[model samples]
Target: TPHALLLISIDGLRADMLDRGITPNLSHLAREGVRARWMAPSYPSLTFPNHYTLVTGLRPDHHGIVHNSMRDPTLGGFWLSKSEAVGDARWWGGEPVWVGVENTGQHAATWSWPGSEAAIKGVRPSQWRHYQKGVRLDTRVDAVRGWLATDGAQRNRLVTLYFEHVDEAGHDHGPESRQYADAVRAVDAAIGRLLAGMQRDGTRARTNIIVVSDHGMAEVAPGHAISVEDIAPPQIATAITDGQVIGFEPLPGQQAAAEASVLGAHDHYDCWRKAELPARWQYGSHPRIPSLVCQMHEGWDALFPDKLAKRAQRGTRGSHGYDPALPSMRAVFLAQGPDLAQGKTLPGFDNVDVYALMSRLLGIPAAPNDGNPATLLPALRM
Candidate 1:
């Protein structure tokens, strides 16, 4: 019988939290299995882009989720909502691991993956639920437990669980705050409940549980929003602000103007053409991306309006979308099961590698992804 895999994503979970004692479940998983001290996220380092990158094993540029909100001439402007976004294949490029699993005659279930709700390349998971913000954690746990209880007669089961509270809390209070700690504890308790439920049903022993996070968070100082007025209006077409970076899409004929306005306008940010984006980001051309990209300095945010900035400041406690290279922004990865090596830790890995690891674990045929499977394979052997 083929072994099953469970991928759990605790959004906005920083790798450092495990040492802080707020996450007992995660700490247990790390102690029982393997953990990476750091997991680098792809560039612009926003949630939707990084999450998609983890599933597709491609950079944000290749996966086509250039940002949380995307506008392509052909597709129009679209948010990453399940109903409106999933049906458009152009927004999601490269085959997701779940698609690869189903192609090989297995069953894949996703509670919420950024691009999972949408059918991409004419493939959708066998089982998937719409991503609902503010959905109770218990409800998601119930659904996952129900799936695990299905008779073992079923073939090749792969399930993914998404938790957004940690990220949400981080965005609201900052990653190091007590509020963020509370969120981590809540998520840890949820994980404990899920594990207990699975164990009671005798599914725990047979399951390979892979706990991961999309990206970590950073503190954005108040009043850090960059003023667009400093840059000449012609140089900037649209400035899409995430908590940490400002994406500048140059108008078709305004490329030169855009470059001039961004080149040295601020000491806190660097502007470059899409192709010239930092090599470490592994990012470049995707239809949803602008020709030019600007990454803001740490502790700063870029906003289009003061109102939006105020709203974000009041609402979000902790935030991600910063440079993944920063230690504060590195995510977590821990896997444990009968098939995994016990009590081991690996060196830093890239989030992109997770797709390849999942592909192998579920026994699905997959194309080469940006992540190296060998780096994670050792964690899989008991």
Candidate 2:
């Protein structure tokens, strides 16, 4: 049978949020197919890191994307806005699923999945779109449908779709806000549209559809953020990354003072040297990781002094990047297709396992990854 794999990412879609009755389309998929109780994001639980992790099956540390905003000796600064850095192949480690698909002489396409825009491992997807925020959901759906409409050998064997509006709504207004619910409904409708298109074209059943999210969002009260200045003053250290997982590099001669400032537990957060970070996170060994890593408590945030004031002027907002094990950091995972078991519910599994599952569905040999190959077997058929 001709088969294809389509992975959709709804950024910041919390595992629990699906039960709110706002996502009828997603609920239908779950009821008809398989739903993981929840999928634990890799350490840091940030957007770029987790999104890349989903395709690569490597932890953020192992993949060298230690944080969304980071500094590498040779690569300089890497953030979502820096197009050059984001598109640079050197910053991306490991072969993404698209690259694997292409290596097998199969076509792959992607719409706005982070790292998809880059030519990782000297290969790019057969078709890709540069990420432009605020692009209408229907437009993205049309693009995916266009790709799926192609027939014969030229048909894309694998495709990825991304939607960031839900995360944007959650960030501007807390996840509990009415605006967030509307955003969820909107994306749900978009998914419904895509499914309808597939059904009309007779591609719905043969294509493996997997819906996932980078991380969940948690409400952070207005003014619930601490200043990086307090964690590491200019004379003591330099803040490398901000948000829930904050990292700092001590000044040339202020290591002791820097350590003194944030080396232990504080009122709303805790800090640990990269080497001493919790082992379960599977982080801290990457060269891009800063010397001192601090994690904000759930429902709290870490921002710079200037940004803190700016955020205060706004209303309560939602944030992620907390410890991945927290309920708030859990992401959604729902899959349905010809290759998977029907009407099955799976226990929680790490997001890294998704890469292996994707490889299995494509019948392409999976590259070395952190996922346990056997973890998703129950959801598969013999």
Candidate 3:
């Protein structure tokens, strides 16, 4: 029998955590399966965009999800939380792997996948649970286990489980904080239960379990926020400020002013147009991207208005959404199963390649995606 594919995303799991002696289950997976030293996330390295990139094997620019929140003149400002946002064709321009799986007559299931709430490109998984709160790691694991326990013939051909507690904890507490460590342990325990169930049902040997994360987290420094108010007017219509990055949509004719304000500020940041972004980033021009992108230095952040800065100053422990080129912002990728080579480690791969590798594991023909499938072949038992 062909092996069933199980893709589990442990949000905010950094590659360094594997050796941190906290997540025993993840450590076991790292030892038993192939581990990528660093899985480069898409540029900006935000959650929604990177997760979508992992599925579609496309960069944020190509996939069309430039950020967690999107703004379009006609659609109005929208968060990725909305079902309509997931379903909107303009937001999700590339085909997801589950869609490819279902197209081949295999049943696919998603506990919570970005863009899974809505039908994308007229394709939806055979079974999918809406993204909801209270769906912790344990609940998600139980649901997948229940689906797998049902008659073998009717089991989902592919199952995806998303655990976000680690990411949440990372955001609440720094990645190195005890809170983040506890969250990792909790999620690992849940994975242990899922693995036990698979072993009981004799599916363990035939299931490929892949664990990955969207991006890594970094500690935000005090006095990091670059106040937008300090800059003169006419350079910005609105600014979307994250901890380490700020995106500006210049007024129709204020492009030059916006560029001048940012570039001439001579602050600890760099501003670039969509086309002129860093070569390594390979981002910009997506429908959801702002007109100008400002990426702060490693330890700095950009904040808009007095209120947002005050709010951030009060708390906001951990932060990402920085330069993906930074090693600290690299995510983790680990895979263990009958199809993978045990005790193997792949070097220098991007998150997008995981999608193509997943398709191959499930015996589905690889579709054209931004990922280079060849990069993932090293992890497989050839």
TM-score per prediction, in order, is 0.93, 0.98, 0.93
Task: Give the per-residue lDDT of model 2 (tens digit) for 319-349.
Answer: 9888899998899999988888789999999
Worst 10-residue lDDT window, candidate 1:
309-318
Per-candidate clash tally: 14, 0, 0
Candidate 3, 209-301: lDDT as tens digits: 888999998866555555654543534556764455567777878777777776533567777776777788888766567777777776565
C-alpha lDDT of all candidate models, in order: 0.78, 0.90, 0.78
Model 1 C-alpha lDDT per residue in residues 1-382, reported as the tens digit of each score = 6778998989888889999978888898889988888898888678888888888898887877878876778878767554675567778889888888777777788888777777777788877867766899899998888776676445437888999988887877888788889999999999999999999988899988898888888886566566654443634566754445666777778777778777543677767777787787877766567666777777666555555545644433455676778887899889998888898989898888888777877888866677787778777783
Best by lDDT: 2
Evaluated at residue 178, the lDDT of candidate 2 is 94
Collision count of model 3: 0
> Cα-based RMSD of the predictions, in order?
2.2, 1.1, 2.2
| Candidate 2 backbone overlaps, count | 0
Off by over 4 Å in 1: 152-156, 229-236, 240-242, 306-309, 312-317
Error of 1 at 34 (Å): 1.0
